Design an enzyme around this catalytic site. Structure first.
Site, PDB file in Angstrom:
ATOM      1  N   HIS A  65      34.956 -17.534  48.900  1.00 18.78           N
ATOM      2  CA  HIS A  65      33.914 -18.461  48.494  1.00 18.78           C
ATOM      3  C   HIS A  65      34.008 -19.739  49.280  1.00 18.78           C
ATOM      4  O   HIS A  65      35.080 -20.265  49.600  1.00 18.78           O
ATOM      5  CB  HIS A  65      34.073 -18.732  46.994  1.00 18.78           C
ATOM      6  CG  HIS A  65      33.204 -19.797  46.444  1.00 18.78           C
ATOM      7  ND1 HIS A  65      31.826 -19.768  46.476  1.00 18.78           N
ATOM      8  CD2 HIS A  65      33.511 -20.924  45.771  1.00 18.78           C
ATOM      9  CE1 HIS A  65      31.352 -20.831  45.836  1.00 18.78           C
ATOM     10  NE2 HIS A  65      32.346 -21.553  45.384  1.00 18.78           N
ATOM     11  N   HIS A  67      33.239 -23.263  48.861  1.00 13.67           N
ATOM     12  CA  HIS A  67      33.075 -24.092  47.683  1.00 13.67           C
ATOM     13  C   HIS A  67      32.198 -25.278  47.922  1.00 13.67           C
ATOM     14  O   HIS A  67      32.513 -26.147  48.742  1.00 13.67           O
ATOM     15  CB  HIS A  67      34.465 -24.529  47.188  1.00 13.67           C
ATOM     16  CG  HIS A  67      34.408 -25.369  45.973  1.00 13.67           C
ATOM     17  ND1 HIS A  67      34.961 -24.995  44.769  1.00 13.67           N
ATOM     18  CD2 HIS A  67      33.820 -26.603  45.807  1.00 13.67           C
ATOM     19  CE1 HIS A  67      34.662 -25.998  43.907  1.00 13.67           C
ATOM     20  NE2 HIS A  67      33.982 -26.956  44.506  1.00 13.67           N
ATOM     21  N   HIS A 110      38.117 -20.612  49.690  1.00  9.75           N
ATOM     22  CA  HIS A 110      39.235 -20.014  48.971  1.00  9.75           C
ATOM     23  C   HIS A 110      38.912 -18.626  48.548  1.00  9.75           C
ATOM     24  O   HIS A 110      37.742 -18.253  48.343  1.00  9.75           O
ATOM     25  CB  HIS A 110      39.633 -20.905  47.751  1.00  9.75           C
ATOM     26  CG  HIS A 110      38.565 -21.157  46.754  1.00  9.75           C
ATOM     27  ND1 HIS A 110      38.213 -20.273  45.761  1.00  9.75           N
ATOM     28  CD2 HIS A 110      37.799 -22.262  46.548  1.00  9.75           C
ATOM     29  CE1 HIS A 110      37.305 -20.855  44.964  1.00  9.75           C
ATOM     30  NE2 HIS A 110      37.020 -22.076  45.395  1.00  9.75           N
ATOM     31  N   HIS A 112      38.185 -15.781  46.045  1.00 11.68           N
ATOM     32  CA  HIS A 112      37.526 -15.792  44.746  1.00 11.68           C
ATOM     33  C   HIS A 112      37.643 -14.424  44.113  1.00 11.68           C
ATOM     34  O   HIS A 112      36.702 -13.918  43.469  1.00 11.68           O
ATOM     35  CB  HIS A 112      36.076 -16.283  44.873  1.00 11.68           C
ATOM     36  CG  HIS A 112      35.591 -17.039  43.674  1.00 11.68           C
ATOM     37  ND1 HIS A 112      35.732 -16.620  42.375  1.00 11.68           N
ATOM     38  CD2 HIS A 112      34.968 -18.241  43.589  1.00 11.68           C
ATOM     39  CE1 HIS A 112      35.233 -17.553  41.565  1.00 11.68           C
ATOM     40  NE2 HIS A 112      34.761 -18.559  42.262  1.00 11.68           N
ATOM     41  N   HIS A 397      39.950 -29.813  31.665  1.00  4.16           N
ATOM     42  CA  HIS A 397      39.396 -28.707  32.423  1.00  4.16           C
ATOM     43  C   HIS A 397      38.377 -29.188  33.440  1.00  4.16           C
ATOM     44  O   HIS A 397      37.370 -29.788  33.038  1.00  4.16           O
ATOM     45  CB  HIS A 397      38.716 -27.688  31.488  1.00  4.16           C
ATOM     46  CG  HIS A 397      39.630 -27.159  30.447  1.00  4.16           C
ATOM     47  ND1 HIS A 397      40.570 -26.172  30.751  1.00  4.16           N
ATOM     48  CD2 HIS A 397      39.714 -27.430  29.121  1.00  4.16           C
ATOM     49  CE1 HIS A 397      41.223 -25.943  29.626  1.00  4.16           C
ATOM     50  NE2 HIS A 397      40.747 -26.672  28.639  1.00  4.16           N
ATOM     51  N   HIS A 400      33.175 -26.293  37.221  1.00  2.00           N
ATOM     52  CA  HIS A 400      32.494 -26.204  38.512  1.00  2.00           C
ATOM     53  C   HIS A 400      31.347 -25.226  38.396  1.00  2.00           C
ATOM     54  O   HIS A 400      31.458 -24.169  37.776  1.00  2.00           O
ATOM     55  CB  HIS A 400      33.481 -25.732  39.567  1.00  2.00           C
ATOM     56  CG  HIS A 400      32.865 -25.336  40.858  1.00  2.00           C
ATOM     57  ND1 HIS A 400      32.108 -26.188  41.635  1.00  2.00           N
ATOM     58  CD2 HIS A 400      32.886 -24.169  41.525  1.00  2.00           C
ATOM     59  CE1 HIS A 400      31.693 -25.521  42.710  1.00  2.00           C
ATOM     60  NE2 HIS A 400      32.165 -24.286  42.684  1.00  2.00           N
ATOM     61  N   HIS A 402      28.649 -23.076  40.826  1.00  2.00           N
ATOM     62  CA  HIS A 402      28.243 -22.611  42.146  1.00  2.00           C
ATOM     63  C   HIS A 402      26.721 -22.871  42.364  1.00  2.00           C
ATOM     64  O   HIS A 402      25.957 -23.014  41.430  1.00  2.00           O
ATOM     65  CB  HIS A 402      28.475 -21.104  42.272  1.00  2.00           C
ATOM     66  CG  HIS A 402      29.906 -20.676  42.282  1.00  2.00           C
ATOM     67  ND1 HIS A 402      30.293 -19.634  43.071  1.00  2.00           N
ATOM     68  CD2 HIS A 402      31.040 -21.071  41.652  1.00  2.00           C
ATOM     69  CE1 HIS A 402      31.591 -19.412  42.862  1.00  2.00           C
ATOM     70  NE2 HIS A 402      32.083 -20.286  42.023  1.00  2.00           N
ATOM     71  N   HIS A 452      32.467 -22.187  35.802  1.00  2.00           N
ATOM     72  CA  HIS A 452      33.791 -21.884  35.293  1.00  2.00           C
ATOM     73  C   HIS A 452      34.705 -23.055  35.428  1.00  2.00           C
ATOM     74  O   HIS A 452      34.518 -23.943  36.242  1.00  2.00           O
ATOM     75  CB  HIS A 452      34.371 -20.652  36.020  1.00  2.00           C
ATOM     76  CG  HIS A 452      34.584 -20.822  37.488  1.00  2.00           C
ATOM     77  ND1 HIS A 452      35.734 -21.361  38.017  1.00  2.00           N
ATOM     78  CD2 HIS A 452      33.806 -20.509  38.538  1.00  2.00           C
ATOM     79  CE1 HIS A 452      35.624 -21.356  39.329  1.00  2.00           C
ATOM     80  NE2 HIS A 452      34.464 -20.837  39.702  1.00  2.00           N
ATOM     81  N   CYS A 453      35.795 -23.005  34.623  1.00  2.00           N
ATOM     82  CA  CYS A 453      36.897 -23.934  34.858  1.00  2.00           C
ATOM     83  C   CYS A 453      37.577 -23.562  36.182  1.00  2.00           C
ATOM     84  O   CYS A 453      37.806 -22.387  36.441  1.00  2.00           O
ATOM     85  CB  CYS A 453      37.922 -23.801  33.723  1.00  2.00           C
ATOM     86  SG  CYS A 453      39.258 -25.002  33.996  1.00  2.00           S
ATOM     87  N   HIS A 454      37.880 -24.562  36.997  1.00  2.00           N
ATOM     88  CA  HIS A 454      38.508 -24.335  38.294  1.00  2.00           C
ATOM     89  C   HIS A 454      40.016 -24.336  38.244  1.00  2.00           C
ATOM     90  O   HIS A 454      40.647 -24.182  39.302  1.00  2.00           O
ATOM     91  CB  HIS A 454      37.969 -25.299  39.342  1.00  2.00           C
ATOM     92  CG  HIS A 454      37.810 -24.678  40.699  1.00  2.00           C
ATOM     93  ND1 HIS A 454      38.845 -24.157  41.432  1.00  2.00           N
ATOM     94  CD2 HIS A 454      36.711 -24.461  41.471  1.00  2.00           C
ATOM     95  CE1 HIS A 454      38.355 -23.659  42.573  1.00  2.00           C
ATOM     96  NE2 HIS A 454      37.058 -23.831  42.640  1.00  2.00           N
ATOM     97  N   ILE A 455      40.612 -24.408  37.054  1.00  2.00           N
ATOM     98  CA  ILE A 455      42.033 -24.051  36.914  1.00  2.00           C
ATOM     99  C   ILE A 455      42.044 -22.528  36.972  1.00  2.00           C
ATOM    100  O   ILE A 455      41.500 -21.842  36.091  1.00  2.00           O
ATOM    101  CB  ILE A 455      42.628 -24.611  35.629  1.00  2.00           C
ATOM    102  CG1 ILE A 455      42.654 -26.138  35.680  1.00  2.00           C
ATOM    103  CG2 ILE A 455      44.031 -24.024  35.404  1.00  2.00           C
ATOM    104  CD1 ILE A 455      42.943 -26.831  34.367  1.00  2.00           C
ATOM    105  N   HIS A 458      42.910 -20.277  34.180  1.00  2.00           N
ATOM    106  CA  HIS A 458      41.950 -20.279  33.076  1.00  2.00           C
ATOM    107  C   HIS A 458      40.733 -19.421  33.386  1.00  2.00           C
ATOM    108  O   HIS A 458      40.244 -18.730  32.490  1.00  2.00           O
ATOM    109  CB  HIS A 458      41.518 -21.724  32.763  1.00  2.00           C
ATOM    110  CG  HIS A 458      42.618 -22.616  32.328  1.00  2.00           C
ATOM    111  ND1 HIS A 458      42.376 -23.960  32.074  1.00  2.00           N
ATOM    112  CD2 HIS A 458      43.928 -22.336  32.102  1.00  2.00           C
ATOM    113  CE1 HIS A 458      43.548 -24.452  31.691  1.00  2.00           C
ATOM    114  NE2 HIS A 458      44.496 -23.518  31.702  1.00  2.00           N
ATOM    115  N   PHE A 463      37.545 -18.132  31.290  1.00  2.00           N
ATOM    116  CA  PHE A 463      36.806 -19.403  31.023  1.00  2.00           C
ATOM    117  C   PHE A 463      35.622 -19.555  32.004  1.00  2.00           C
ATOM    118  O   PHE A 463      35.646 -20.392  32.905  1.00  2.00           O
ATOM    119  CB  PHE A 463      37.749 -20.577  31.081  1.00  2.00           C
ATOM    120  CG  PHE A 463      37.433 -21.746  30.172  1.00  2.00           C
ATOM    121  CD1 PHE A 463      36.520 -21.690  29.134  1.00  2.00           C
ATOM    122  CD2 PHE A 463      38.159 -22.913  30.335  1.00  2.00           C
ATOM    123  CE1 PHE A 463      36.383 -22.748  28.256  1.00  2.00           C
ATOM    124  CE2 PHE A 463      38.008 -23.993  29.466  1.00  2.00           C
ATOM    125  CZ  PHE A 463      37.136 -23.900  28.422  1.00  2.00           C
TER     126      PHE A 463
HETATM  127 CL    CL Z   1      29.905 -23.660  45.059  1.00  2.07          CL
HETATM  128 CU    CU Z   2      40.688 -24.963  32.360  1.00  2.00          CU
HETATM  129 CU    CU Z   3      36.173 -23.607  44.584  1.00  2.00          CU
HETATM  130 CU    CU Z   4      32.118 -22.988  44.106  1.00  2.00          CU
HETATM  131 CU    CU Z   5      33.899 -20.061  41.324  1.00  2.00          CU
END
Ligand code: CL
Ligand code: CU
Ligand code: CU
Ligand code: CU
Ligand code: CU
Ligand SMILES: *[C@@H]1O[C@H](CO)[C@@H](O[C@@H]2O[C@H](CO)[C@@H](O)[C@H](O)[C@H]2NC(C)=O)[C@H](O)[C@H]1NC(C)=O
Ligand SMILES: *[C@@H]1O[C@H](CO)[C@@H](O[C@@H]2O[C@H](CO)[C@@H](O)[C@H](O)[C@H]2NC(C)=O)[C@H](O)[C@H]1NC(C)=O
Length: 497
Positions: A65, A67, A110, A112, A397, A400, A402, A452-455, A458, A463
């Site tokens: 992905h 980001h 990164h 995904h 948290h 994020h 997309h 989603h949470c980006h941790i 999670h 999440f």
């Molecule tokens: Cl994105």
């Molecule tokens: Cu989280």
């Molecule tokens: Cu990302």
């Molecule tokens: Cu993204």
């Molecule tokens: Cu994502």
């Protein structure tokens, strides 16, 4: 050197020892972090990703992905596994061929798939602006002014034991740093500046989990960009940066020639700086080659507060200036129990058929889409508001979206919304118990967009939801190449699905 906008990118396994401890990894371009992918605003990126992975302990499939890049008309290139594609199998390659109209700033790429980016597949992605409105604020902006902050684990991501707490073993700044336990005096990163010059430092969190309190002894930092969005100048002496966020800041090399500590304090893992953990070195040209002797203050004078940031351009806020003042106002119930996260009562588990492929095959309401209850339709050409009230364990948290950036109408730790001039960004801390962080955007980008949470731990624990934006126009808006159509049959064959 930077690579792109047209490049190959090989994904391999290798041993690395960024904190003195050797472990295998999943790498782009043979390094941690991966090489910077770069181009100019509006360019056509063609990133041919070669999956050369052979070690199943970190997964031999992959998907990448980009980001923060909107992927308008190229949803198939976005990268989230089982949302927009099936993974690329080992021994195959896939051309992510997309354009970046209307965007310029600091991004990253990164894996995904699962928690694989934690195992090393992470790197910077910079879209320069030849006509940058901030150009006159600095002298130098190049690969030497990118600062990555990363969490690094000795235990492999797939091998983190069920039921034990996950914390990192080192903070890596530009790929180097020292371990929190059994600390050895392994090399620290050096960022070099020349006295009198001004630098556009592009600060990128490539974290799988912790947020960092980032500072530079003796210096302050003038923020000019937030997650790709140009800001008014905001001078701070510390930046709390959450997973996946980016800032550009002007660093004025205006202190005496010398060595200064660069600090990145994670919210979990090792606390402080003993033995040079959580540290890198800012070295002026002509300084002695030795460690800094500087200290941090006890209390920072001007920490970043998100409500202090404002766009450089007149971006405003779509909709009406009150809660619910949108065409499609949502409030998500974000929860955690018993090892799993949920959104509106549903824990995300990736489907067998990617959401995009389900839509292209004729599923045309969100109740038709799998996973059931995890896909929410959005109407086209509409103002969307999403309230994200905090409280779920494991916070704060960083959520994020997309395909989009968004106005941050309400920020962490402050109950007052801003319908006038809040910053826009793509990853936002939802704060602490009782907060009501809220985002707004307009739906002008048909396709399924992950929220989603980006941790990453999670996300893996559920999440997330998918916003199926403008289902009716998704197929016409996103013509797919044959190679994309070939992904799922190849993946399913390899996996006996
Ligand atoms: Cl994105
Ligand atoms: Cu989280
Ligand atoms: Cu990302
Ligand atoms: Cu993204
Ligand atoms: Cu994502
Ligand atoms: C966060 O803000 C949202 C609105 O953006 C609040 O949502 C309302 O919630 C109440 C029940 O709590 C409902 O009666 C309304 O229909 C919702 N929408 C409105 C008023 O616009 C939500 O309560 C807020 N959450 C927190 C924790 O403060
Ligand atoms: C809490 O958030 C609010 C809303 O973003 C902030 O209020 C703004 O404060 C600035 C600076 O004084 C004023 O110009 C704006 O008119 C305010 N907007 C609104 C809607 O009230 C506020 O400063 C934040 N609180 C703290 C402590 O930073």
């Amino acid at each position: 050197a930077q690579i792109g906008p047209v490049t190959d990118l090989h994904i391999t396994n290798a041993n690395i020892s960024p904190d003195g401890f050797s472990r295998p990894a999943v790498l782009a371009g043979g390094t941690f972090p991966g090489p910077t992918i770069a181009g100019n605003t509006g360019d056509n990126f063609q990133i041919t990703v070669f999956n050369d992975l052979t070690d199943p302990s970190m997964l031999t499939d992959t998907s990448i992905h980009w980001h923060g890049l909107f992927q308008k008309g190229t949803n198939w290139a976005d990268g989230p596994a089982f949302v927009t594609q099936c993974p690329i199998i080992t021994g195959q390659s896939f051309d992510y061929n997309f354009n970046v109209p209307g965007q310029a700033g600091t991004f990253w790429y990164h894996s995904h798939l699962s928690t694989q980016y934690c195992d090393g597949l992470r790197g910077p992605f910079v879209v320069y602006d030849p006509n940058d409105p901030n150009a006159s604020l600095y002298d130098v902006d190049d690969d030497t002014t990118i600062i990555t902050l990363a969490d690094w684990y000795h235990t492999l991501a797939q091998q983190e034991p069920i039921g034990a707490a996950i914390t990192a073993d080192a903070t890596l700044i530009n790929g180097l740093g020292r371990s929190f336990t059994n600390t050895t005096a392994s090399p620290l990163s050096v960022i070099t500046v020349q006295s009198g010059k001004r630098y556009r430092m592009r600060l990128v969190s490539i974290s799988c989990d912790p947020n960092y309190l980032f500072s530079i002894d003796g210096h302050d930092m003038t923020i000019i960009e937030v997650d790709g969005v140009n800001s008014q100048q905001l001078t701070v002496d510390q930046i709390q940066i959450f997973a996946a966020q980016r800032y550009s800041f002007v660093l004025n090399a205006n202190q005496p020639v010398g060595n200064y500590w660069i600090r990145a304090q994670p919210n979990s893992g090792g606390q402080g700086f003993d033995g040079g953990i959580n540290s890198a070195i800012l070295r002026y040209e002509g300084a002695t080659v030795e460690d800094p002797t500087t200290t941090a203050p006890t209390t920072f004078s001007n920490p970043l507060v998100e409500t202090d940031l404002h766009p450089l351009a007149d971006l405003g806020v779509p909709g009406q200036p009150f809660r619910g003042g949108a065409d499609d106002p949502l409030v998500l119930n974000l929860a955690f129990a018993n090892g799993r996260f949920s959104i509106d009562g549903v824990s995300f588990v990736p489907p067998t058929v990617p959401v995009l492929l389900q839509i292209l095959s004729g599923a045309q309401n969100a109740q038709d889409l799998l996973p059931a209850g995890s896909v929410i339709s959005l109407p086209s050409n509409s103002v969307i508001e999403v309230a994200l009230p905090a409280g779920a364990a494991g916070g704060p948290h960083p959520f994020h979206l997309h395909g989009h950036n968004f106005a941050v109408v309400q920020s962490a730790n402050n109950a007052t919304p801003n319908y006038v001039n809040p910053i826009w960004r793509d990853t936002v801390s939802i704060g602490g118990t009782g907060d009501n962080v809220t985002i707004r955007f307009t739906t002008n980008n048909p396709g399924p967009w992950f929220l989603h949470c980006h941790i990453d731990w999670h996300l893996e624990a559920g999440f997330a939801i998918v916003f199926a934006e403008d289902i009716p126009d998704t197929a016409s808006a996103n013509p797919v190449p044959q190679a994309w159509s070939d992904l799922c049959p190849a993946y399913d064959q390899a996996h006996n699905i």
